[PDB]
Symmetry: C6
Subunit: 214 residues, 6 copies
């Protein structure tokens, strides 16, 4: 974390044991790659220095094969950033090193010059966790989801909505799935009940309207 | 949360892990849509910035079908606010975006300019949670409640009072129900005991007076 | 709670999660109406603003029939206060509204003008909890208490002393009960042992002197 | 507790929930009258105002017969103090009321004028707890203690030392007991072993020297 | 820990019980020599004075044979440092004593003069823990690892990656192992599946590409 | 504990409940006389005033026979200090009373004049705990230790190293034991394996070298 001193200069402070434990328990209960960990990480990582975002991620509980993958993606995110942007002549303001906090004192990766590098690092870590999560799902998962025999639509909606979230497809194509796949994937019995209540709203009806049926 | 610095300027601070856990456990023990979560949220969310009210709600434990509904209602609350009020020419002081903290640094959604947007956001979240809760109950629930055979009136009162609370009907019509439905719903045996003790106070007697019987 | 800033102006702060949990656990372990909750509430509620005394009571764990009664009494306490005191012309310094923190920002129910209203509110809540507790006991409970066959006098004293506490009768009439009922309620076997050891101190002997017997 | 503000004026603060729980658990695990509670109370009660020493004692877990006795003794301690000292003309600097914090705002029982009353109150509470503890033991307990058949001397020493502590006899007469009763109470088998090893040190040997035997 | 006072002078503060417990639990759950303990130690030990790095390591939970080894290595690290660097004439700026905080007040091992000694001490402790860990593994562990019959490649990757980490061989030779040993160690059935999917990428394919197979 | 105020004057503060619990749990899990308690006590007792070192030791969990012994030794440590040093004429700067904090306000045993007395008190308490621990072990314990039949050398090393630690013999004579007793105490089977691998290093080999065998 970074503490902004009264004068205006900034100093480094270690992640507060409590916050470290909170992120740890969430990773242990769910997954380091899980969406939950990503959510809490982003909210509390604003203050975290680029080096901390990488040390307090490597202390979190997970498999060693998984950690290699999370570091595989953080590398491809870095190489992309190096490519997407031509270095400015003289090598520019920033480097993947500065961003990943390589060879920097913990009180210099928390100075004002590293605010931008600090944000880009967290951006990559969240993207890396999402990438490992996305691959963990074979494509077509919303298509694969089918309302289980005699299972509440709520349960089907929860599987289907997560499956649509699992896909990295843009929000608009995700929306289409919520409208189209829900009715189709819906088990025939709910689908017949939806057809009578929804009527023409076969795709028009929202998932909530579909939830009203069965 | 927002911290008001001595000078008067305001800065952003993350929800204190302890408070986050307290809201989380309450949601896990009851429901994110449950009244309990709504109560603690409102008391502790005053300081919370509009963005936090939306991030610290999405980290709370609940079903994914339920979260879609809570976001369904927050949308209809926003569209209503956009409709109820004509935008002032030049688009006015505020936008649903400013209110929902869209594209704002966490240290700018906590400045004095966003006090009003901060309150309107929480207003919508509490209303959204109530709406999901209300629909979860089919209308006529107080009418549906009937003192269970050989069950304490206290237990009946607890079901009936919550059922009256479940209805979004104004407080005065809710009061009428406490006076009228209680005696009628009351099982014949308590109802006969209430008739002799209450006498003319068949609807006049308060639920507490009815509690004295059986 | 209210924080007195150095300048002298006051600002509002939410009940510290820890203190909220401490009151909550006590209510869950005992009762919201229980004496224990009343004791801790009074000690820690001094700082609490009138609004908090009512929000941090409604979040505490209890039955919904019970909460109606606690709000029934807080109403009769308010109507009494409205009656006991004629409003001063112009409606006076205070109103039940100001006292119950109705339509007040949480940073204005904590200003110096609301110190008096803040205390009167807590006074009513403690009285309300006591009233629900008192009614929960049918009158004559000390008279009803009888030393159980072959039960330590200590156990009898604990039941009888609480029964005398349950009665809202003034402290002096409560004292008489400790002196008179104890010996009479005492089971014949202890009562015979008390008669020989106490001698003339049949009512003169304190409960502690009676405790020495059996 | 009392907080000494920078200027020098003092203000009242509630016992920190953590410290309250620590004293509570100790009382629940041992006893409110137990020595353990008395030890922690004295160390942490220095700051506590006279009123707090009486409110944070009445919230602690114990039987209601026991609490009457603890209040019985606090009364006889007060009447003694009222007797032991003639009131100075005009009624003097202090009163049992000021000492027991009767009719005083919690921010006035923590001002410098009440430092002396604050200490005298705690003095009485510790003495009161000791008195209830002492009576709980019939006199002659060290004499009653006898090394149990085939029980470690350590276990005997622990019972005997507590029994000597239970007696309110001055420290010097307590010491004599550690030297005399130990050997006599010691079971014949250890006593024979002590006689050969201790030799003339039958009373001369300390309990530690006796511990070396069996 | 070291606290930098406003003036600029530094003072000593004990490791915060919470942080001590966090390191302790991690050591108890894993090992004092375990990598996990090393990670958290390095992140939180920056502030720790050289003396604390040695006292808060000796209080951590572990076997006494293990602690001798951790102190064996810290000695050979010190003798190396004494050798690697000739002492400057007059014995130079620093000594293994100053580094290991020998005969220094806890408020002088935290002054600015001991920043360098403070870092060198932690450097040795982390190296010492790694050395005990490395020896605990017989050389050739990656070679020893063989994908267990009918075990997920993920599980094999986790064993193999840790085995490659166990070896103190430079990062580049470790990388070669991830590319070469993985396919060879891979059980014939996965190895055949890898051969068809990987094709020429027998060593070219990354562990993640190998993970895609079985 | 002692708090150094900005001006420079010092004030007393009670041991932070958390730190008290941490020392308590360690004593309960191990022993008040155990080495573990001694380690944490020394690190956290620097700030503690002489009176606290004696009150926060008497509240710790242990047998009453044990506490008498810990107070037996603290007395012989004091009498030694009184003897070892002639009192300076006028009775000198210090007294065992000042050191043991006898008849001193808790805000005067924490002033700068009592820094020296504060350290000497803790010195005695640690020595007292060690003395009780040492006697608890009959002399010759390292000689007594013999590698248990079919038990890892590690387990033998752990028993032997603690046994060498149990002895209060100077560090150099303790070292000789680690070199000599280890091989001799080692069970014949490990001893034969050590003889072949160690060769001439029968006493030359360190315990770690011996650990490599069996």
């Amino acid at each position: 974390p970074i503490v902004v001193q009264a004068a205006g200069g900034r100093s480094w402070k270690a992640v507060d044991s409590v916050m470290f434990q909170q992120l740890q328990t969430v990773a242990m209960q769910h997954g380091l790659v899980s969406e939950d960990f990503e959510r809490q990480l982003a909210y509390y990582a604003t203050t975290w220095t680029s080096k901390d975002i990488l040390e307090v991620l490597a202390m979190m509980p997970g498999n060693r094969a998984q950690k290699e993958l999370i570091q595989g993606k953080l590398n491809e995110e870095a190489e992309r950033w190096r490519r997407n942007n031509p270095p400015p002549p003289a090598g520019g303001g920033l480097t993947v090193d500065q961003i990943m906090g390589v060879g920097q004192t913990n009180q210099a990766a928390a100075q004002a010059n590293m605010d931008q590098a600090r944000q880009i690092c967290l951006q990559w870590v969240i993207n890396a966790l999402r990438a490992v999560r996305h691959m963990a799902h074979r494509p077509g998962n919303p298509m694969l989801v089918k309302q289980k025999t005699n299972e509440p639509y709520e349960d089907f909606a929860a599987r289907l909505l997560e499956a649509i979230d699992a896909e990295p497809v843009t929000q608009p194509i995700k929306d289409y799935l919520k409208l189209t796949l829900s009715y189709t994937n819906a088990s025939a019995d709910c689908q017949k009940q939806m057809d009578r209540t929804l009527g023409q709203r076969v795709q028009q009806a929202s998932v909530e309207e579909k939830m009203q049926a069965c």
